[PDB]
Amino acid sequence: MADVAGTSNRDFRGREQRLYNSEQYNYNNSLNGEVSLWVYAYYSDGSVLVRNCNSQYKVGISECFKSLKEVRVGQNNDPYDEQEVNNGVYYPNGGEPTKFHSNAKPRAIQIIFSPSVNVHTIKMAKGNSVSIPKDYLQRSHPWEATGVKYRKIHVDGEIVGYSHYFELPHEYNSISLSVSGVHKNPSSYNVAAPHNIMDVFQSCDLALKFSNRYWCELELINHYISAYAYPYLDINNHKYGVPLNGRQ
Amino acid sequence: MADVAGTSNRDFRGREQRLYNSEQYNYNNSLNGEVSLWVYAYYSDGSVLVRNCNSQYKVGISECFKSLKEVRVGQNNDPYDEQEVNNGVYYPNGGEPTKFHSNAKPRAIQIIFSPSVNVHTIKMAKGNSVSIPKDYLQRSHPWEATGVKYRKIHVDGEIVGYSHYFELPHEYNSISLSVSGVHKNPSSYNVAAPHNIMDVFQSCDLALKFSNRYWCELELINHYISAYAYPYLDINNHKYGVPLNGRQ
Amino acid sequence: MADVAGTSNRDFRGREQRLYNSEQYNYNNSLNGEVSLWVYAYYSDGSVLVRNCNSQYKVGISECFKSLKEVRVGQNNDPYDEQEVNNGVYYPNGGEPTKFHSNAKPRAIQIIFSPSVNVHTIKMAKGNSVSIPKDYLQRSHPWEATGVKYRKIHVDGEIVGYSHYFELPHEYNSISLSVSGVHKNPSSYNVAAPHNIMDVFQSCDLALKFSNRYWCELELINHYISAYAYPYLDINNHKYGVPLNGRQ
Ligand SMILES: Nc1nc2c(ncn2[C@@H]2O[C@H](COP(=O)(O)OP(=O)(O)OP(=O)(O)O)[C@@H](O)[C@H]2O)c(=O)[nH]1
Ligand SMILES: Nc1nc2c(ncn2[C@@H]2O[C@H](COP(=O)(O)OP(=O)(O)OP(=O)(O)O)[C@@H](O)[C@H]2O)c(=O)[nH]1
Ligand SMILES: Nc1nc2c(ncn2[C@@H]2O[C@H](COP(=O)(O)OP(=O)(O)OP(=O)(O)O)[C@@H](O)[C@H]2O)c(=O)[nH]1
Ligand SMILES: Nc1ncnc2c1ncn2[C@@H]1O[C@H](COP(=O)(O)OP(=O)(O)OP(=O)(O)O)[C@@H](O)[C@H]1O
Ligand SMILES: Nc1ncnc2c1ncn2[C@@H]1O[C@H](COP(=O)(O)OP(=O)(O)OP(=O)(O)O)[C@@H](O)[C@H]1O
Ligand SMILES: Nc1ncnc2c1ncn2[C@@H]1O[C@H](COP(=O)(O)OP(=O)(O)OP(=O)(O)O)[C@@H](O)[C@H]1O
C-alpha cells in the first residue's frame, strides 16, 4: 504494498477521518440536525447553573426570577428567607428577609447557541422580576431580536457557536428570562408548513432538557463543555469548541 | 406666550398623554402585543397562589391536582402526610393521611385574561384528580369552551380584563386544570399560517411565567395586581384595572 | 307486554349499552378525542413512577436523567449524596457520592400509548445522562422512530393500547428520555394546517399531566390502571384494559 501514510491521495484513512468530521458538522446543520441553547447563570460563589435544551427545528428556554436563583441541592438554602427575598424583589419593601442582596441572584448570564442556529431568528425576553418584558404588559413587545449582539465563538477559523453575555452587577438587575432560536434553514422548504408541521409539534415534545449547577467555571469547562464537545467562552475570553468542517 | 393649559386644542401635553395611553391599549391588542392569563388558587388560610403566563399570539397554563395545592415555602408542609392525601384523592381510600380534608386544597379558582384575549377562543380542561377531563379518557373531549361564562371586568366603562370564577367548596371538588386563550386577531391574516408559523412556535419558547403565593387577597391586590396594572376582581366583586383607551 | 330480555332485536337496553361502549371507543379515535402517553419508571424497591400526559392531536413527555430518579416524597432521599451521584453520572469520576449504584436509578422503562395513537408517528429520544440523543449533538438525529417495536396490548381481541418496554439492567444504562406520538388521523384533513393550526397550539397549553410514585405494580394496577380504564402490561406479561368496540 500500500501507499505510505500522509504522502498520497490514497490515504483513505485520512480521507475518511476528514469526511467523518465534515459529515457531523454538516449533519448538525441539516434540517435533520439539532439546534441547541445553553443559558448559564453565574453566582457570586463562583458556581454556574446551566440550563440546556436540545431540539430539532427550533429551541428555547424560559425562566423566571425564582428559577434562575442559586439552589445548592442538599445543602442549606434558607428557603423561608429566600421566599422573603422574592417578595422583596417582586415589589419594593414587599418582604422581610434578613439581607439586602441575595447571593443566590445571578451576577451574569451567558446565552450560547450551537453553530446550527440562524442568528437572525434569535429572540430574548429579558423581563422584570414578575415576568413582564418591559415594565408593563400593555407596552411590552414579547421579545427583542438580539442576534446582532451575538459574538461568534471561533476555533481554528470555524464558528463553533454564538455567545451573548450580559452582567447583572447592579442591585436592580433582577430579571426573568426566555430565549429562543431557530435552526438554520437556507432552503425555501418551510419545516412548519403543512407537509411537516406536525413534526415540529412533536419536536416540542421531544426536546431534551438538562440542568445542573457546577461548582465553578473550571469544572463546567472540564466536565460539561469539553466532555460533550460544546462551545463555550470563559471569563478570560478564551474560546472552547471542536472545529470539524473539512478538518481531521 | 403659549396657550393656557386645559383651555384649547393646543394642549399638546394633554394630547400626548391621551395618545400614550391609547397607544398602550391598542398596542396590547395588536398582533405584536401580549395576551396574558392568570390562574388564582384560593386557600382556606386566606392565601392565594397565582400562576401567570404572558405570551404573544396565544397563552396557557396547565396544572395538576398536586401543583395547585398550597405550598408554604420554607415552612412545614407535612410532605409525607400530603403525599398520602394525594394517594387518597387519586383513588378513594387509597392513602393513610392524618386528615379528612387537606387545607392545602384550593377552595376556589379565578381565571383572568388580559383584555387582548378573544373570549371565543378560550378553552379549559377542568379535570379530575388524575388529570382526565371527564372521568374517563375514552369519553373526554380534551376541553370545554367556556368564554360565554367570562365576565367583563369594567373600569370607567372600559373592559380591562375577563374573569371566570368557580368555587370548590365541596369535598369532591378535587381538580386538575388547564386553560388556554388566543390573542385577538380581527384581521384575516393567520398568525400561524406558513408566513409566520415559526414565530408562533418561538412564542411557546418565549412565554414568560410567574408563580407566587401571596398571604392574602389584600397583599395580592396591593403588590401584584395594582403594582403591575393587571386586572382583578376581588371577593366583594370590586373591579381593579387601569382604563387606557382615549383616556388621560 | 314488552319483549323478553336477551331474546330479540328489541332489547334496546342491550343495543344502547353496546352503542355507549362503541361510541366511547370511536370518539377516542376521532380528531376530537384524546391521545395519551404513559412513561413508567421502575425502581429496585418495587415502586413505579408514572408520568402521564393526555392531549388532543399529539402528546409527549420529556424527562432528564435527574427527573426519572426515584423521589420518595416526605421521606429521606439523601439529596446531597444524590446530587453527587448526578455529578458522577454526568461525567465519569465527576462526583463523590457514598455509593457505586444509586437505587434511585430506574431499572426499566415502559412506554404505553392509548389505542388512539398512530404507531408510525411514535418518536423517542433515549439520550445519555446529559440529554444528548446519541453521545454528541453533532451526530445526533433528535429522535428514533420506534413504532415497529411497540407491542399491541390485546384484551378480548381488541387493541386497548401499545407498549414498548426496555430494561436498564446495566450500570451504564443512565438515560434521559423524551417520547412523542400523534393521534390517529386517517382523513386527509391536516389538523395542523391553517384551518385548525391554532387549536393544535392550544392543545399544547391544554394537555393535562399527571405524576405519582406508586409503592408497587400491584398498587398501580389496582388504583391507577384499573381505576381509570387505562391499558397496562405487567411484569408477567398480563394484559390489562377494557375492550369497548361493538361490545357490551
Ligand atoms: N495553516 C497553517 N498552519 C500552521 C502554520 N504553521 C504552524 N501551523 C499549525 O498547523 C496547524 C494546521 O495544520 P493542518 O491542519 O495540517 O494544515 P491545513 O492548513 O489545515 O491544511 P489541510 O488540513 O491539509 O487542508 C494549525 O493549527 C497551526 O497551529 C502555517 O504556516 N499555516
Ligand atoms: N363623564 C362624566 N363624568 C363625571 C360627571 N360628573 C362627575 N364626573 C367624574 O368625572 C370623571 C370623568 O372626567 P373626564 O375624563 O375629564 O370626562 P370625559 O367624559 O372622559 O371627557 P373627555 O376625557 O374630555 O373626553 C368620571 O370618572 C367621573 O367620576 C359627569 O357628569 N359626566
Ligand atoms: N365467542 C365465544 N365466546 C365464548 C365461547 N365459549 C365461551 N366463551 C366466552 O364468552 C365470551 C363472549 O361472550 P359474548 O360477548 O356474548 O359473545 P360474542 O362472540 O362477542 O357475540 P356478540 O357480542 O353477541 O356479538 C368470551 O369472553 C368467552 O370467554 C365460544 O365458543 N365463543
Ligand atoms: N501560524 C499560522 N500561519 C498560518 N495559518 C495559521 C497559523 N496558525 C493557524 N493558522 C490557520 O489559520 C486559520 C485560523 O486559525 P486560528 O488558530 O487563527 O483560529 P483561532 O483559534 O480563532 O485563533 P485565535 O483563537 O488565536 O484567535 C486556520 O485555518 C488555521 O489552520
Ligand atoms: N356621574 C356621572 N355622570 C355621567 N357619566 C359618568 C359619571 N361618572 C362616570 N361617568 C362616565 O361613565 C362611563 C362609565 O364610567 P363608570 O365610572 O360608570 O365605570 P365603572 O367603573 O364600570 O362604574 P362602576 O364600577 O361603578 O359600575 C365613563 O365614560 C365615565 O366617564
Ligand atoms: N373459548 C372460546 N371460543 C371461541 N372464541 C372465544 C373463546 N374465548 C374468547 N373468544 C373470542 O375470541 C376473541 C378473542 O378473545 P380472547 O379472550 O382470546 O382475547 P385475549 O384476551 O387477547 O386472549 P388472551 O389474553 O388469552 O390471549 C374474542 O372475540 C372472544 O369473544
Author numbering:
A (entry chain A), B (entry chain A), C (entry chain A): 1 to 248
What does the paper say about this structure?
Cypoviruses, members of the family Reoviridae, subfamily Spinareovirus, possess a single capsid layer with turrets and are commonly embedded in crystalline occlusion bodies called polyhedra, which are formed in the cell cytoplasm and mainly composed of a single virus-encoded protein, polyhedrin. To ensure the delivery of virus particles to the target intestinal cells, allowing the transmission of packages of infectious virus between hosts by oral-faecal routes, polyhedra are disrupted only when they are exposed to the very alkaline pH environment found in insect midguts. The fold of all the polyhedrins is highly similar – a β-barrel core sitting on a base domain, surrounded by a common array of five helices (H1–H5). The strongest intermolecular interactions define a trimer composed of a cluster of three β-barrels sandwiched by helices top and bottom.
The exception is the polyhedrin of CPV18, which has >80% sequence identity with that of CPV1, consistent with their relatively recent divergence. The ATP and GTP bases stack with each other and with the phenol ring of Y172. There are two substitutions in the binding pocket, K154H and R155V. Despite a strong overall similarity with CPV1 there is no pyridine bound in CPV18. Many of the key residues that bind the CTP in CPV1 (H76, N77, D78, S79, Y80, D81, D96 and R98) are substituted, including H76N and S79P, which interact with the phosphates and R98T which stacks with the base. Clearly these changes are sufficient to disrupt CTP binding. Although the two molecules are very similar (rmsd of 247 structurally equivalent Cαs 0.23 Å) they behave dramatically differently in alkali buffers, CPV18 being far more sensitive to dissolution.
